[PDB]
Nanobody, 124 residues
Framework: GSGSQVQLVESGGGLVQAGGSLRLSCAAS????????MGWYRQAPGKQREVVAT???????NYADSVKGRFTISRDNDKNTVDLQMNNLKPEDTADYYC??????????????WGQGTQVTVSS
């Protein structure tokens, strides 16, 4: 079909131990146009793909109350790939982490880009 020029690639999805920390990165490539909103989502077994953290136009960050103080996200427009600092990995926090990039196009067009969710395995 018709697809956008930007692609998302999530880095991370490794194997960490209970209590450990991991950093995931979302690589946006395709267009030099300033990406408008970036966020991290999680797909957990038994749950729906939940919002973990979002960053708006001004880097307006919103995190789930359950990730406050443990998860931190950072966004550069194009010199860096968006960071997700995850600390205190719990055994049952093993899930897929997805990246969402939202771009405000032209005047009134909005697109949600989803990447390839990588699964983080926590060793207990």
């Amino acid at each position: 079909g018709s697809g956008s020029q930007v692609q998302l690639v999530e880095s991370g999805g490794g194997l960490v131990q209970a209590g450990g920390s991991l950093r995931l990165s979302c690589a946006a490539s395709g267009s030099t146009f300033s990406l408008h909103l970036m966020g991290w989502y999680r797909q957990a077994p038994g749950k729906q793909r939940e919002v973990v953290a979002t960053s708006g136009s001004g880097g307006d960050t919103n995190y789930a109350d359950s990730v406050k103080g443990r998860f931190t996200i950072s966004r550069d427009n194009d010199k860096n790939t968006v960071d997700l600092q995850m600390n205190n990995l719990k055994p049952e926090d093993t899930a897929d982490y997805y990246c969402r990039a939202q771009q405000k196009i032209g005047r009134d067009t909005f697109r949600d880009y989803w990447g390839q969710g990588t699964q983080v395995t926590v060793s207990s």
